[model samples]
Target chain A: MLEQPYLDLAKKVLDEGHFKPDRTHTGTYSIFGHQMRFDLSKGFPLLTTKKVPFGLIKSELLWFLHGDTNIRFLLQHRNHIWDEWAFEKWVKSDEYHGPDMTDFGHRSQKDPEFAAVYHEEMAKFDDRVLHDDAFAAKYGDLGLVYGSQWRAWHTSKGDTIDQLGDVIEQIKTHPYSRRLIVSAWNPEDVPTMALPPCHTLYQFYVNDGKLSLQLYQRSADIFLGVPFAIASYALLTHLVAHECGLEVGEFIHTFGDAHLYVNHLDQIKEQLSRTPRPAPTLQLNPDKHDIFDFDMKDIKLLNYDPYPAIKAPVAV
Target chain B: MLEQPYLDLAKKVLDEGHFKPDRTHTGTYSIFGHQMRFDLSKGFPLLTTKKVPFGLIKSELLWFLHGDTNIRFLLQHRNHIWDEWAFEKWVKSDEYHGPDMTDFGHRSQKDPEFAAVYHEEMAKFDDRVLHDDAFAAKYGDLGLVYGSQWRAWHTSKGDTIDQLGDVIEQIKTHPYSRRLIVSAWNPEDVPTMALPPCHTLYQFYVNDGKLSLQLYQRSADIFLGVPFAIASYALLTHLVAHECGLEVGEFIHTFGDAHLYVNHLDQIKEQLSRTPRPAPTLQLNPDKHDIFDFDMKDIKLLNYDPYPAIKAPVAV
Candidate 1:
């Protein structure tokens, strides 16, 4: 029942969402403007219908909180979620030579031969990012991603604003304030970024000593992206609450283009068919009040009995 | 039926919204993350329960489309909704040789003697703005309001980005694009702003040859602001649809803190008790394909029969 809204969103899109072709040649069954609210009081809403990797979500959020923009932090946590972006950046640069990996996201999937070469290069790139300090400094940095936008928003005058830091202070000092918000969409940077932020902007609201958050995601691949987004923001809500000394209220996930990629409909329908189990309860280290100081071990998930993971192709 | 969602939102907030003290003395009964959708296929969703001033809405939106930040244009159209902001700017300036207007918003409401002086000085300021070009240029300009941010978003490189124009073009050329968005929440300018953008950011989505919009408003005064915001964005949806040669779809309004000002509870309840009537339809001039090319004469509201207006004090 904790994740019914997600299932409902999937069903609504499948039944009513129409096809909208996208850049990747993978068209989507798209609907506009959907809001799903998960009350954190019930439990941590990690999807039990299908296995959601809480490990990646944990490392990623912790990385974000530390105002980190590089993939080395994530890599050190054994997460390769951001490897492609850094790899693309490195390949695009003039510094190092690598095998031709043009359209690697699509190429690797289609050609087995290319896949072998691509994997070799990606691993080498990953290894260089991990071992070589100067190389990691040059290639691993993801400029103006979530962490950068949240923590070091660049102003016109060559200054950076700590948006997340300011809002955390606002939450602690002015809890009733309605202006607790952080935005990631900068018009200046969006023109040429490999992928713009999908989670565009978010706001924090405090009422009755409970802290709630609402996120406006500009685009969502409902099946693949939505599950992770829900749990990630839920974890964010809990983390913020933990730091601010408030009870967790709800996590409201709103969308602009809430879509199910045409290729992933079967994956979603299969997911919808499975019965949802009790949501897992999250345990944060009681000693850790400062969110930025949190490490991987400080957070833990309990009783997450989920259905087997569903495999779906990435839409590139 | 078209406006049921609006009514639903109001009722939900009234029934469940907890009290949250705001910047103003008039605190609110607030609910976080509420959404209401108005399908344009039914009719325009100008509320039939109470009279909404279509004329003011018309002029205001037209002014925004023109990218005019000065209140002189609005004043020329006999719209005084923005008069106070301009007046505040003037009264707070060193050049203003007038009676002290300290805490004007609250003082003018409470003290009869102060109200008369405030009204007299405000009218004098208004008259000067109308007659004198230099005075209007200096004081009447409300910097970085809706129109300024919508059109001339300042970049760190000292250039301005036409966000609305870009989005409009994106809609026309790439109908399936997911990133058709315009944001008013500039983290660079939010601090020390007189009033930050309440209707924060919006995105346009195209599906089935129809254009739909989603607005993530950070705050909504359910009694006063929500009615106007609903209709304003509805008009925007129609105008955009008209310009793009697409059918109007839906206007999904999502909120972060939707609330009823404690003082306006009576007015909202009275609105709820009234029986609703048929919704009005909007007609944009077919000849004016460019949204900015249209004037007040080009847009029309049809079959709008509604109850009398309910007056409530504005929470400055």
Candidate 2:
């Protein structure tokens, strides 16, 4: 029942969402203005209807905490979630002499021969990013991703403001303050960036020694992205609460454009049909107090029995 | 019936909100992470259970459209809402030889003698701001408010970015784009500002040839401010839709910390007891297409019948 809201949202979208063409050119069943609340105290809200990889979520969150924008740390953890963003940059750069990797995202999904080439190029790119320091330094860095925006927000005076650090301090000092927020949508940087921040802003609220977080995501790829996003932010809320010596509360997820890619409709239906098992319990290393210093070993998901992974095409 | 959601929200807070101390030192009956939607196509969302001053809302919104940070424009239009923020700066300066106005917001509400003195000083300040150009330039400008943030968002390179202008263009050109957002929360400016933006960020969505907007307000004073806020943003959505040659859709309001100050409990209870009248219909001058070009005379509200205004203390 803890995961019923997620299922209900998916069901609502399927029943009432209108057809819309997205930037990916893959049509979508989409609706605007949807909210889902997961009470973290009940259980960790990793979806049991579909197996969501908790490892990738853990490492990716840690990377954001450390303010690491480069793909090096994620590569070291074998998390390829952000590989394509870096790969897209590399293939377009002058140094990339591989077979024309233009439109690689769509081409790979459609053409088998191109898919093999794309896979080989991506692997090589990831290897170099992990091994070659200069190459990684040049291309692996995602200029203004969440990590950079969270940790080193560029100010007009040429100084970088640590929004996350400041917010944590605010929580410690003024726990009841309504202004405790971290924003990633920089209007100055949005125009030049390829993918603007989807998780635009989030606010933290403290009541009765319980910390709650509400995230306003501008765009959500509901089927593939929402699961990861839910678990990711929940883990973040837990970590922050732990750091501040508070109990976990609700993680409220709000969206602007929540959509299911037409190609992923079958995968979502399959997910909806499966009954959700017992929700998982997350374990954090009691010795580690600071969220920024968390490692892969420090976080664990217990009793996460999920249905087999449902396959869905990525809407490039 | 159009205003039922607003009534529902207030009722919900009264029924279930926890006691929480807020920034104003006024305790509140508060709930975190709540949402309400108003279908603008059905009718204008101006509250019918209580009388909301539509003139002040109109002028304030128009001020934001002009990107005017100076309170002089508001004073000229007889809008006293922003006069306090500007007056606070003036009364605090060494140039002031007036009675001690420190902690005036709280003092005025508590002590009648101090209230008279504060009112006189504020009147003097407003008069000077309206007539004295030099004095107005010195203290009447409340920079980093919604007007400045929405229109002339300061950039790192000493340039100003018009976020509202750009977002409107995006809505017109890329109607289905998920990135049509205008953000007022700048991390760079928050620490230095007296008050960070409460109406933090808003995103525009286009569907079925209609425009919908969702606002992520980090903090809302539900009794006095939210009624004004709902109509303000709804009017904004209508204006933008008109300029872009689209019909109006829904206005979705999402909140972080929605609270009714303890002082406002009686007033809110009275509001909830009243029946909501038929919603008002807003009329815009068809000849005036561009929202920025229109004056107060161009916007009109038809058939707004409501209960008498309920007086309450503002938690300044």
Candidate 3:
């Protein structure tokens, strides 16, 4: 039932959304200003309509929580989700003297020979990020990503403020405070960054010993990105609530420019056809109270039986 | 009608929202994450259920357009909405002794005798702001308000970026670009501000030659503030669309903490009971293309037939 909202959103977009050309040159059926609520008190909202990997979600969120912008931590957890962003950085840099890796994301996906070369280069890059300390510090660290913005926001006075840490403190001290917000959208960094923050800002609300989170995502690739996003944020809400000593409430997901990429139309249809299983329950290790110290082992998903994985083209 | 969605939101919140204590200590029946869409192509979304002051919205928006932080401009237009914020600064500062103005906003509404003294001091403050250059420079400037954030966002490099101006350019050049966002929720600034921006971030989406705007407001006072906010942002969307050489699409209003204060419950119920009238048409001067140059005469509302303005206490 918690995951029904996800299916409903996909269905709604498919039926009523307008055809719009997007930046990735992948056409989409798009609609603006949509909201979905998942009551975490009921269950964890990991998608049961399609197989969603909870491991990648946990590792990525932990990476963000630790204020680690490097892909090394994610790689250590065997999560390849952020490999491309960090890989792109290395290939684009002057230090990269390897294969002509220009437009590698799209080229690799399309051409077999290029795909081989990209995979080889990406493997080398990932290895370097893991093995080489200085190289990882230089290339692997993604400045101004969610990790950086959330944990260490650059101030006008040449100092950094940990927004996530402060917000947790606020939740502890001022549960009823309307100003419990963590923003990743930095106007100063947005112009220069390769990809601006899609998960723009989030606010926390506390009522009746339950903690709720509302995320304002500026853009959503409904088919591919949204499931991961929902799970990741839900996990985050659960962890934050645990740290603040409160029961989990709803995870309110608000979106601007929510779209289903044209390439993923069949995949989404396949996904919608399948019946959603009973919602999964997430179990966080009671011994680990601090969210920042959480590792992949500390988080576990219980009774998550989903449909077969639906393959969809990546909209570069 | 354009107003039905708003009425629906009010009805939904009233029926199902949880009772919660707010920062203002005026208890609110609150719900998080709600979206309401107003199709501007149908008509301008000025509330027909009750009279919304169009002049204040116009002047406030125009002030933001000009990037004017000084209340002198607003006061010049006889808009006293921001006068309280500016007056608070002067009364709080260690200047010449004035009547005890602490908790003035609540006291003025409750006690008529105290209200008179507060009004007199406020009159003197406004006069000084209007007449004396030094006084206006000292106290009338609200540094981190929407006007300052929208127009000249302070950078970490000791410079300023015109976010509104830059966003307008992005809209013109890259209509399909998903990065057409203007964010006011600076993490660095929120900690120190008097009132962190309630209208946190907004994104503009262009499709089929129509410009739509979706605003993510972190908090909403449904009875008093949301009506004014709706009209304000709708006006903004129209102006931006006009400047971008496109027809107005929709003003999609989204909220984080959407609530009705207990005191304004009777007022909102009365509003819900009334039937919505035909929406008013907004006439922006065709000759005046640049939104920044828009004056009082440049914008007009035609055929605005509505019930009398419903009064409610503002939770400040």
**lDDT ranking, best first:** 2, 1, 3
Clashing residue pairs for model 3? none
Residue by residue across B79-181, what tens digits does model 1's lDDT show? Answer: 9989888998887888888777878878877886998898888889988898799999998898788887889889999999888989999889998888898
Give the worst 10-residue stretch by lDDT in candidate 2 chain A: A103-112
| Candidate 3 per-residue C-alpha lDDT over B1-316 given as tens digits, one digit per residue, 9 for 90 to 100 | 8888889988988998999987778889988878888888899888899998898999999999898999999999999998888888898899949778888998887786998898888889899899999999999998888988998998988888899999999999999888898888888888888889999889998988999999988888887888889899999999998899998888988888899999999999999999999999999899999999989899999999998999988888
Please say which candidate is ahead in lDDT: 1 or 3. Answer: 1
> TM-score of chain B, per candidate?
0.98, 0.98, 0.98
Candidates in descending DockQ order: 2, 1, 3
- Reference-based TM-score of each model: 0.98, 0.99, 0.98
Q: Candidate 1, overall lDDT?
A: 0.89
Q: Rate the local accuracy (lDDT) of all candidates.
A: 0.89, 0.90, 0.89
Separate DockQ for every predicted complex: 0.85, 0.92, 0.82
Full-model lDDT, candidate 2: 0.90
**lDDT value, residue A173 of candidate 2:** 97
The residue ranges of model 2 lying beyond 4 angstroms of the native Cα positions read none
The residue ranges of model 3 lying beyond 4 angstroms of the native Cα positions read: none
